[model samples]
Target: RGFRKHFNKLVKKVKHTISETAHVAKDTAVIAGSGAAVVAAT
Candidate 1:
């Protein structure tokens, strides 16, 4: 039971980290996209 619980916690942490990374990547893409657009326009 203890091992199962620990495994579940690890899984949850991994999922959370992956989600956070994806979120950051999305934000970064938005920022880069806007910057590139403005530069190209100018």
Candidate 2:
């Protein structure tokens, strides 16, 4: 069986929105205090 496919797309949309609005690079912006950036926050 394969993993769900739509998850990543949804994640990308939200991540892109945040990144664009915040004017941050996907690699450097930490979404929370746990060290996970917004891109990885998915």
Candidate 3:
């Protein structure tokens, strides 16, 4: 039971981090798109 407790906590933390990172990546991508547009102009 003790092992299960730690296992569940770790699983939840992993999922939470994945979702958080995805949002950050998405925001960065949007910012990067503007730079990409400038590159395409040349």
Candidate 4:
């Protein structure tokens, strides 16, 4: 049960992060941590 709970949390975190990243890329054309233009473009 504990392992399952942790796994679910991890999955949720990953999903949320990906969603946020995509949103950022759509809006600003880059990820939050990416400051270099080429890095963001790639």
Best by TM-score: 1
Task: Give the alpha-carbon lDDT of every model.
Answer: 0.79, 0.65, 0.77, 0.73
> For each predicted model, how many residue pairs clash, with residues at least 3 apart or on different chains?
0, 0, 0, 0
lDDT of 4 by residue, 1-42 (tens): 357887888999999888878776665745445456666668
* TM-score of each candidate structure, all chains considered together: 0.41, 0.38, 0.39, 0.40
* Overall local distance difference test of candidate 1: 0.79
Could you tell me how far off, in angstroms, the CA of residue 22 lies in candidate 1 after the best superposition?
A: 0.7
lDDT of 3 at 11: 87
Q: Which portions of model 1 miss their true places by more than 4 Å? A: 25-42
**Pairs clashing within candidate 3:** none
Better of 1 and 3 by lDDT: 1
Candidate 3 on 1-42: residue-level lDDT in tens? 367887888989999888888877676666556677678877
> In angstroms, how far off is 7's CA in candidate 2?
1.4
Winning candidate number (lDDT):
1
Q: By TM-score, highest first, what's the ranking? A: 1, 4, 3, 2
Kindly report the root-mean-square deviation of model 4 from the true structure over all alpha carbons: 6.6
